[PDB]
Structures are given as C-alpha cells and as structure tokens.
Design a protein around this ligand. Structure first.
Ligand SMILES: Nc1ncnc2c1ncn2[C@@H]1C[C@@H](O)[C@@H](COP(=O)(O)OP(=O)(O)[C@@](F)(Cl)P(=O)(O)O)O1
Ligand SMILES: [Cl-]
Ligand SMILES: [Mg+2]
Ligand code: NA
Ligand code: NA
Ligand code: NA
Length: 326
DNA sequence: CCGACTGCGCATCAGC
DNA sequence: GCTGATGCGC
DNA sequence: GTCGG
C-alpha cells in the first residue's frame, strides 16, 4: 500500500498499548491514525503533512518524521527487544487470551506455545480452543472458500426453516478477496423487537451446522450470539481445509438494517459513523438509531427502512459496503 | 486546558 | 442463586 | 494520543 510502512508502525504501536500497556484509548487513537493514513491517496512526505489528517497529532507526526528519515522507530525497536512485551504480545495472539490473562501467564512462567500446550488445564474453554487452532486461525480465507462456506450455511439454515434469512457480512459483504473469519447475520420472523414467539432459534441453526460437521467447536454461545469454529469438507485424498472462525448473530427481523450495517463494518467505520452520529445528536447500535435528548438520554428508536435511512439521519451521503473498509 | 473517546453479548468472578 | 464488575472479542 | 469548545 501507499503508506504501508507508516500504518504498519502505527498498528504495532496500537497493539503494544492494548496488549502491554493496557491503555485502550491510546490503542484506539493509534488505530484511528493508521486508518486515516491508510485512506490518504498520497505517499506521505513528512509528519507535518500527516498531521493535517484528523486523528494524527503532534506525537504521531514526530514518529512519522523519524520513520521517514530512518526506516525505523527506536521506540518500537526497544519494545521488540523487551522480553516481557514480546511474551505478552505473543500470548494475546491466542483467541481468548487478552491483555490481563497474558500478563498473568507470564507471571506464572507460561510464555511460549510449548508452555501453553503443556498447561492446557490452566486455560478456560475459549483459550483451549484458541490454542488448538492457533495456526489455523492466523490463516486468511480466500473469497472462493467464503463462497463455499456461504453456500453450506445458507442451505443448511434453509433446511431447518425456510423463513430464516442468513446474510454473510464482514469484509465478505464489503467485497474483499479474502477474509479473516466468517460473520453471519441471522433473522427469523418469529424473533422481533416486540416478541420472541419461538425458542431455540439460534440453537437449532447451530445444531444443524454441527450435525453436518460444518461447525466443529464452540467458543461461546447464548440466545443471540454464537462464536465458534467451522471447517469446509474436503474431497477424497485431499488435504483438509484449515479450521475457521465463525460468528453468528441473531438479530430481530424488524432491526435488520441496523444489524447488517453493524455486522458489515468495518469496526473502525462503525466507530467513525457512531462518533459522527453523536455529533449529530443520535446514537447508533446494531439494533436502533435513537435521538439523544437534552440530557443525553437516548430517546425512542427512529423508523428505519434501509441502510441508507441510517446514513440520512446523520446527514452522511450513502456509502456502499465496498467503501466502508476503514 | 481537559473531559470524552462507539457500543455490546457471553464467560467468569466477587460479594451477598 | 442474583447482581454487578471485569475480561474478551466482536 | 487526539481533539473540540
Ligand atoms: N469494536 C467494534 N465496534 C463496532 N463494530 C465492530 C467492532 N468490532 C467488530 N465490529 C464488527 C463490524 C463488523 O466488521 C463485524 C465483524 O467483525 P470482524 O472482526 O470479523 O471484522 P471484519 O470486518 O469482518 C474483518 F475485516 Cl476484520 P475480517 O473479514 O478479517 O474478519 O462486527
Ligand atoms: Cl488509554
Ligand atoms: Mg469478520
Ligand atoms: Na491532525
Ligand atoms: Na487473544
Ligand atoms: Na468475526
């Protein structure tokens, strides 16, 4: 990419602040600056030119100047040499091991992949599955495999109840040629904001996908959100496909547009769009857009009949999913 | 200067 | 058990 | 770490 070196550096800084410093706002600030620089359609020549962008301030401008002059950042070179930071950054790459658990594991002398595998009884369920598929979960998914996965999910859901609608969202819906995981939005006319007329709506879909050996593991599962593991079937004498992360979110059918806007993302795009909504006097989540009163209490959900209606309330021109990869 | 920073489901834990 | 806070990942 | 008022 055009400024890949700078955005890589800012992302590494973001990950340091989240994982090691446990400084969530610095993490988000670095991600915001990386995102704004990644969309900028010029090869940046100086930190002063970058500082013109929203989210880039004095400190990041100085780092950009160092990086442009030298190709490196001394701050990051030292972080990369710190064993505790190195150990924590590694451990958090396992799904279910966050900043707190990683630091605690290092305290206890659990610092490597070998240590983790030798101490599975110290891991909770999520962490245990994250360790099992550590290698697979770092592989990306070609869009061609996403289409095969889409075809299984939609057809198996149809077999359970033809009134379900499953929608693959995430980067897939934004048109990307590869995805990190699969995100599935699910609706059923029995589940609305007014009532739940049928139980086990998500459970029945999950069990059917398990029945056919598509879903292989469960990280967490409640009434509306499933997070787990899946795998495409392979052919005779073929190597097996990697196991893949899959999330399924059951959303009330009358709130589909807020749900699909949310599950399409990107995460930064949602963050930016919700921040803008607040400046316009609205709050947006995956269910509703609501006005904010004088006191800041959210009012009643506003009528929504398309994704564009949401954009219209906050006076943004509509952006197709392909243009939401921030 | 400095308060605020997008918004939330599920797992886990502490206190009662 | 409930309720609330925290961790985690979305 | 950045920024709006
Ligand atoms: N912190 C967040 N705040 C608001 N919305 C959020 C947040 N995290 C994830 N979301 C999102 C948006 C959407 O992409 C969805 C999917 O979450 P995701 O982590 O799978 O992101 P993605 O866009 O699908 C991807 F490009 Cl990273 P991937 O294809 O590699 O997986 O839920
Ligand atoms: Cl912070
Ligand atoms: Mg995804
Ligand atoms: Na700026
Ligand atoms: Na992790
Ligand atoms: Na996901």
């Amino acid at each position: 990419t055009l400024n890949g070196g700078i955005t890589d550096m800012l992302t590494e800084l973001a990950n340091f602040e989240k994982n090691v410093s446990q400084a969530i706002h610095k993490y988000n600030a670095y991600r915001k600056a990386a995102s704004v620089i990644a969309k900028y359609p010029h090869k940046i020549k100086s930190g002063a030119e970058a500082k013109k962008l929203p989210g880039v301030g004095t400190k990041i401008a100085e780092k950009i100047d160092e990086f442009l002059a030298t190709g490196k950042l001394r701050k990051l070179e030292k972080i990369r040499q710190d064993d505790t930071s190195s150990s924590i950054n590694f451990l958090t790459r396992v799904s279910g091991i966050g900043p707190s658990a990683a630091r605690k594991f290092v305290d206890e002398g659990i610092k490597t992949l070998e240590d983790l595998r030798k101490n599975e009884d110290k891991l909770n369920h999520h962490q245990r599955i994250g360790l099992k598929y550590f290698g697979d979960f770092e592989k990306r998914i070609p869009r061609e495999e996403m289409l095969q996965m889409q075809d299984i999910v939609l057809n198996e859901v149809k077999k359970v109840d033809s009134e379900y609608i499953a929608t693959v969202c995430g980067s897939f819906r934004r048109g990307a040629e590869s995805s990190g995981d699969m995100d599935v939005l699910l609706t059923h006319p029995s589940f609305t904001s007014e009532s739940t007329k049928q139980p086990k709506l998500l459970h029945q879909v999950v069990e059917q996908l398990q029945k056919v050996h598509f879903i292989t593991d469960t990280l967490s599962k409640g009434e509306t959100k499933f997070m787990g593991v899946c795998q495409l079937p392979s052919k005779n004498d073929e190597k097996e496909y990697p196991h893949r992360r899959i999330d399924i979110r059951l959303i009330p059918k009358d709130q589909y547009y807020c749900g699909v806007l949310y599950f399409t993302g990107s995460d930064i795009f949602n963050k930016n769009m919700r921040a803008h909504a607040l400046e316009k006097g609205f709050t947006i989540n995956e269910y509703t857009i609501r006005p904010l009163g004088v006191t800041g209490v959210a009012g009643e959900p506003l009528p929504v009949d398309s994704e564009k209606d949401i954009f219209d309330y906050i006076q943004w021109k509509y952006r197709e999913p392909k243009d939401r990869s921030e």
